[PDB]
Structures are given as C-alpha cells and as structure tokens.
Structure 1
Amino acid sequence: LVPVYIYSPEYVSMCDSLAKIPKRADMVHSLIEAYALHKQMRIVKPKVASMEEMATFHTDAYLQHLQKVSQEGDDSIEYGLGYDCPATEGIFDYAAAIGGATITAAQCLIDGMCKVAINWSGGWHHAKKDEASGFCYLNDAVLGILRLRRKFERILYVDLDLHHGDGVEDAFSFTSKVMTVSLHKFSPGFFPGTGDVSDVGLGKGRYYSVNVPIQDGIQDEKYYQICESVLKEVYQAFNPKAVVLQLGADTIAGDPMCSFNMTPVGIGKCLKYILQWQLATLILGGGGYNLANTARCWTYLTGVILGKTLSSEIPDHEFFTAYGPDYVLEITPSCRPDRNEPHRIQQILNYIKGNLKHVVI
C-alpha cells in the first residue's frame, strides 16, 4: 500500500492565504514535486471541514466569531486574534481547510486506504478549544485524533515539534484512550511554558500524558536515543492501535528559533522507528520557520516514508534560488554547544519509566 498524500492546488494556496509563514506550503510541495515523490504516493483531495466537524473540539462561540468576522470583519472577547487585525476575514476558511484535510487523512486511515497518510500543512497543536495560539487557529491534530477514535481503541500522539503540544495534551488530559507524548524545549519563559516531566495528565488520564523536557543545542544522536527510549517504553505499556505524528521542523539547525540543533536525518530515525510498528499512522507538519530548511526536512522525511534516498542536489524548480548558497538537500548542524547534561537526561527517562508502570491495559 502506497502512502496517502493530502494535496490539491487549491488546498496549498489556501494554506498560504494567511501569509503567516509566506508560501511555505507551496515551497514544501514544490520541492516534493521536484523530487517527483508525489508520483509514488496516492494524491488525495482534502475535503473542507463543516461547522459541526470543527465543533467536535472548538466551542461554538469561537467558531461563530471566526465566521462572523469572515463576513463583517473585526469590550471585545479574547480569542487570541489580536495579531490579525489587518486581516481576519480569511481565518475561517483557512481553519476549515486545515481541519478538513487532517480529518480526510484520518478517514483514509479508517477506510483502510493506506497505512500512512500525510498532511504536511497540518499539525497546529497549540490552538485551544476557544482561542488561537502560537500561529495555530484550529487544532487539526485534535480533530484528526477524534476522528480516528471512531475506529481505533487506543491512539498514540507523538509531538516532535520544538514546542510543547499543549493544545493536544489538554484536549485528552482526562482520557486514557489517547496517550500524548511530547519532546520539547522546556525552560522558564519559553513558549508555551507547560510540559514539565511531572505533567502526566489528570483523572482517568493520569500517567497517559508523557512530557520530555529538553535543553538547547541537542543533536541527532542524543535526540534519537532519548526518543527511542521513551517510545520503546510507551509502545510496550500503552500498545497503540494508531499513531498521529507531529513533525514540526523548528528543531532543525538554522531555524530562527535557534534552540535545538537537529538535522532531518535525526528526525528521520525517530520516524523510521515509529513506522517500524506498522500501525495506521497520520503524519502532520507544524512549526518550521526556516522556509527552505522546512521544505528540505519534510521532503527528506517523505523520502524516508517511501524508503527512498534522494539525490543531494536540489533540483531546479520554482523556488530553487531560495536554497543557496549550497543548493543541497543535506543540512549541516550549527557550531553551537549542547546544553543537555547526561545525568539530567537519565533522570527524566527514569522518571517517565516509573510513570508508565502505572499504565496497564
């Protein structure tokens, strides 16, 4: 079975319509297209999310506000839209397209159309039920998981974005049918502030939330050791039936965030380990603010999913000029120190290992 690739020219243009991260969705698809990887996948046109589908997580008051300002424009209520005053009218359609695409990919998984479904323009994990947050206006990850819960009894959410996927974790904080695992930078003052190793969920969902606080400057080898160690324990204890994987590329060297020092090869190993489970897997994007590097990463990861080694030279295409001055696919880690102490890392792993002992199905 070939991977499902959620794409349409109308979808890509809609994903860039807010211009929060200028033409990233187009650059990502164009590079994938330039390597002709789409030829090896099953292209699926995304459906648009209805009001009811989006309301499975987001409140009516929030959604109705987005639809209203799409029609009329912006003591007003706080929905986290204070940075979009010049243009709020396109947010509702953006959210509906983002939401619909991830739901579509999830439905493909349910229908048995594939084992892997890809939506690189999704993975907006910060959005709350009643407010936007961190460039996330709608949490498609939550909508995707909720859709998969119709078919699969236990869902594992893995968030490899630089930031803590607080929106997704809070959505399922009280349930034990969905386990969230997040690897992220954790430091006083760093967005979004949550996701300490001691945060393990609430009520029936206690110990069904896993957080791995990491410090600046981590590289491929250390990251994969940490990630494999956690996933190994999580898989054995929770025994997931489906996986939703968020692959925010703002961990990659060269990103304006300038925190982690990763390359796409390191992320690719984590992905390879997850794919090894051969479970129904929903692949999502997320953060990534070095445009060319994000296209580089997600194109490489697409190659990993297809089990193909791409040529090192960036092929000529629409955005070829943006890949200078090297014009290659490989990304070189920065000359920046690793702030992660080995003893602290082992403590965290042991702490999590203790937590997962409580998890028994």
Structure 2
Amino acid sequence: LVPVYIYSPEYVSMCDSKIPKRASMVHSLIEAYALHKQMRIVKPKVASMEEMATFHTDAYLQHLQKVSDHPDSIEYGLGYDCPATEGIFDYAAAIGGATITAAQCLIDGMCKVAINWSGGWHHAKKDEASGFCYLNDAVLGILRLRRKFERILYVDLDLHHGDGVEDAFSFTSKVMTVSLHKFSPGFFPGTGDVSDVGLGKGRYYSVNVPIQDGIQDEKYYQICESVLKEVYQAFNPKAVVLQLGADTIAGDPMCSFNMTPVGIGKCLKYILQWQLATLILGGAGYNLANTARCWTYLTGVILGKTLSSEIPDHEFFTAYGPDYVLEITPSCRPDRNEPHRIQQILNYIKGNLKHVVI
C-alpha cells in the first residue's frame, strides 16, 4: 500500500560520517515537506556477516572489519578512492542492512515501493572496494529479492556505469541490469559500452546505454523510455531495483550531464506504472542541496504529490540559498549527443533484446 521509508536517527548519523551530513540533509528536507507522514517508517537492521557474504568474500569482509596503511588494503581496493577510516565496516553493514531490510519489506508484501536513499553503492565488487563503494548494497538487495522473484530488473540512472552490479550478475539471466551512464574514454569506470551485454548464460541480460556530456531531461527520457519499454516487453521483470544517483543533475561538480529532477522523475514514473515491487536507492550526488532537492522531489513523485516550490524552513534551510526553491535550472552548455548515434545505440539494444526470452 503505502511506501516504506527506511529511516532511523542512528542510521542517518552513521551515514552522515565524501558526502558529509548529506543523509541528514535528504531526510530533513523530506521531513520539512512532511512526506514522512505519508510513508511507513521502517528502522533498518544492520547486515549480519552471513548476509553480507551472500555477495562479498569472507576474506574481504574480515579485512574491512580489521582496518575499521595496512599492507593488504591496496589488494582490497582500499586507499586512494576508498580510504580506510575507523568504523567504515559498521557504516557498510548499516547501508547493506538498510537495503536488505527494504528488500524484505517488498518480499513480505508490506509495500510495493521501499526507499533507502542512503544506498546505491554500485561499484563495489565481491572482494574489492571501488569508487567510494565499500559494500554493494544493491547486489545484496537483489540477492534478497531473489528469495521470491524469478526475474529482477536493475536500472541504474547514476552518471557512472553500474559495473559492480552488472559484473555480479553478468553470467545469469535471472537478473537483467540496465545502466544509462556517461561513456567516454578516460571516464570512470571505463566499462559499459553498448556492446557489453554480459557473458555466457547471461549474454544479452546486461544492457548499457552510453551517453555523452550535456544531455537534458527530454532527450534523456526519450532514451530511457525506449530502452525500458523494450526491456519490459522482452524480460517481463517481476521486481525492480532502481538506482538514482543525482550526479547527473545540473550543478553537480561532475559537470557532465545536465538533468533536472523532473526528467529523472519521468523515468521513475514510467517504472512505477509497471506496478511491481520496486526498491528505490540513491547513490552518488556531490552538490548536497541539489541531491536533497532531487530525492525529495522524487519522493513526492513516488507519493503522487506536487511539492511547493518554496524550500520550507528546516535545519539546513540556509544551504538552499540564495533563491531557496526546489527547482533546478539546467546549465547553458551544449548537448553533445548526436541524434543518429543515439538511435544507433537504441537499434543495437533492440537487436540484443530479441535474444532475450521469458
């Protein structure tokens, strides 16, 4: 019935310690619009060792636990991108447990939509941290959904390729991954061309949409809708995990895409009208107020509400200056997506999906 909102004061505090206080900012703006009163608030459980090991190796988890300049930390992806800091293991278990909790609410029929805005760390591998992701909560959520759902669709609308989730399932046809992302030689993580379709028994069950700098709402939605329409018809998913990293939004320091929350919101609406069990994740997002703006707007989308344009007073009201509105304005810079290259990509994907059964 009513969407589940994964939240506790303790969870937000844990998450608050790259994105300082971002979790507080997201939650307080959502509360400032009183959207929490229309959702079922569910305290997240901390992920157990066994739950985390549904994906990650015990060697990696014990190392993460142990360092939470160790000679083995380079081997496990900890360092330049993923600093070893105290309590990072408790932080990871909290995020992983929160997404698992959301997945369990979906399995139990408590809701059709469960939200963990602090999840979405799509780069972590079974045995290695990557791209500021210590634990892959999306994979953990998908593996939990697999207890019930025979076909799971993962949609990744983060600026970056969801490589960790794709690689985790690249050999299976039970989970289809779809990532829209900037793809450009030199741009992290460097994978996810349209020719990347998965491996072995999973061949054609990964979909990658490489997009160039400067794309705005209308063309982004056209791409997303056409891919997801073809995907829905070909795969007939029974559950969806949706990653909504806001580093695509105009004003992010990544300064790559030029999206607003309204355009992401149309993609979200298209997925929601499927009326499937849907697990909503956040992810990256480096302009903190814009990320709160985005995910607050999307929470309203989930609840079918139109939010007031004026940022309501709350703890972080001043971060929304000097104009204090919810809307985000695209930057005045070129869209580098050639329409015929985009259509070539769509044709390639359509052909790939003709091989997908059931």
- Relative to the length of structure 1, the TM-score reads 0.97
The DSSP-based 3-state class of the residue aligned with 1:97 is: helix
| Partners of 1:279 and 1:240 in 2: CA distance | 8
Tell me which residue corresponds to 1:15. 15
Residues 334, 86 of structure 1: alpha-carbon distance in 2 compared, 3 angstrom cutoff? closer
Is the 2:82–2:130 contact (alpha carbons within 8 Å) kept by the matching residues of 1? no
Shift of 1:52: 0.7
Is the 2:171–2:198 contact (alpha carbons within 8 Å) kept by the matching residues of 1? yes
Is the 1:127–1:138 contact (alpha carbons within 8 Å) kept by the matching residues of 2? yes
Is the 1:79–1:132 contact (alpha carbons within 8 Å) kept by the matching residues of 2? yes
The DSSP-based 3-state class of the residue aligned with 1:30 is: helix
| Partners of 1:235 and 1:87 in 2: CA distance | 40
Is the 1:292–1:322 contact (alpha carbons within 8 Å) kept by the matching residues of 2? yes
- For residues 299-336 of structure 1, the C-alpha deviation after alignment (integer angstroms, 9 at most, x for no partner) is 00000000000000001111011101110000000001
| Partners of 2:147 and 2:306 in 1: CA distance | 36
Larger deviation, residues 37-46 vs 127-136: 127-136
The DSSP-based 3-state class of the residue aligned with 1:101 is: helix
Is the 1:15–1:121 contact (alpha carbons within 8 Å) kept by the matching residues of 2? yes
Moved over 4 A (4+): 72-77, 84-87
Q: Is 1:116 matched up with 2:113?
A: yes
| Partners of 1:247 and 1:163 in 2: CA distance | 11
- For residues 11-57 of structure 1, the C-alpha deviation after alignment (integer angstroms, 9 at most, x for no partner) is 0000112xx21110010000000000000000000000011100111
| Partners of 1:86 and 1:343 in 2: CA distance | 42
Residues 209, 22 of structure 1: alpha-carbon distance in 2 compared, 3 angstrom cutoff? same
Is the 1:242–1:280 contact (alpha carbons within 8 Å) kept by the matching residues of 2? yes
| Partners of 2:3 and 2:114 in 1: CA distance | 6
Shift of 1:202: 0.3
Shift of 1:221: 0.2
Shift of 1:73: 7.8
Residues 288, 336 of structure 1: alpha-carbon distance in 2 compared, 3 angstrom cutoff? same
| Partners of 2:150 and 2:84 in 1: CA distance | 41
| Partners of 1:255 and 1:77 in 2: CA distance | 29
Cα RMSD after superposing both structures: 1.4
Shift of 1:105: 0.2
Shift of 1:356: 0.1
Identical residues among aligned pairs (%): 99
Residues 30, 73 of structure 1: alpha-carbon distance in 2 compared, 3 angstrom cutoff? farther
Is the 2:81–2:131 contact (alpha carbons within 8 Å) kept by the matching residues of 1? no
- For residues 320-357 of structure 1, the C-alpha deviation after alignment (integer angstroms, 9 at most, x for no partner) is 11101110000000001000000000000000000000
Pick from 66, 71, 85 the counterpart of residue 68 of structure 1: 66
Residues 76, 351 of structure 1: alpha-carbon distance in 2 compared, 3 angstrom cutoff? closer
| Partners of 1:76 and 1:138 in 2: CA distance | 15
Pick from 30, 38, 48 the counterpart of residue 46 of structure 2: 48
Is the 1:73–1:88 contact (alpha carbons within 8 Å) kept by the matching residues of 2? no
Structure 1 unpaired stretches of 5+: none
| Partners of 1:217 and 1:281 in 2: CA distance | 29
Is the 1:253–1:263 contact (alpha carbons within 8 Å) kept by the matching residues of 2? yes
Residues 91, 74 of structure 1: alpha-carbon distance in 2 compared, 3 angstrom cutoff? farther
Shift of 1:151: 0.3
| Partners of 2:327 and 2:185 in 1: CA distance | 33
Residues 141, 75 of structure 1: alpha-carbon distance in 2 compared, 3 angstrom cutoff? closer
- For residues 258-287 of structure 1, the C-alpha deviation after alignment (integer angstroms, 9 at most, x for no partner) is 000000000000000000000000000001
Is the 2:78–2:84 contact (alpha carbons within 8 Å) kept by the matching residues of 1? no
Residues 114, 74 of structure 1: alpha-carbon distance in 2 compared, 3 angstrom cutoff? farther
Shift of 1:176: 0.3
Larger deviation, residues 125-134 vs 260-269: 125-134
- Relative to the length of structure 2, the TM-score reads 0.98
| Partners of 1:155 and 1:172 in 2: CA distance | 11
Shift of 1:84: 8.0
Is the 2:213–2:336 contact (alpha carbons within 8 Å) kept by the matching residues of 1? yes
Is the 1:74–1:88 contact (alpha carbons within 8 Å) kept by the matching residues of 2? no
The DSSP-based 3-state class of the residue aligned with 2:208 is: strand
Shift of 1:85: 9.0
The DSSP-based 3-state class of the residue aligned with 2:313 is: coil
The DSSP-based 3-state class of the residue aligned with 2:128 is: coil
Residues 316, 352 of structure 1: alpha-carbon distance in 2 compared, 3 angstrom cutoff? same
| Partners of 1:86 and 1:184 in 2: CA distance | 25
Is the 2:183–2:212 contact (alpha carbons within 8 Å) kept by the matching residues of 1? yes
Tell me which residue corresponds to 1:78. 75
Is the 1:73–1:89 contact (alpha carbons within 8 Å) kept by the matching residues of 2? no
Is the 2:82–2:131 contact (alpha carbons within 8 Å) kept by the matching residues of 1? no
Is the 1:131–1:137 contact (alpha carbons within 8 Å) kept by the matching residues of 2? yes
Shift of 1:88: 2.2
| Partners of 2:75 and 2:84 in 1: CA distance | 16
Is the 1:2–1:40 contact (alpha carbons within 8 Å) kept by the matching residues of 2? yes
Paired positions, count = 358
Tell me which residue corresponds to 1:284. 281
Shift of 1:135: 1.2
Residues 6, 241 of structure 1: alpha-carbon distance in 2 compared, 3 angstrom cutoff? same
Shift of 1:87: 5.4
The DSSP-based 3-state class of the residue aligned with 1:282 is: strand
The DSSP-based 3-state class of the residue aligned with 1:187 is: coil
Shift of 1:68: 1.3
Residues 181, 90 of structure 1: alpha-carbon distance in 2 compared, 3 angstrom cutoff? same
Structure 2 unpaired stretches of 5+: none
Structural mapping, 1:145-294, within 5 Å: 145-294=142-291
Residues 73, 10 of structure 1: alpha-carbon distance in 2 compared, 3 angstrom cutoff? farther
Shift of 1:89: 2.0
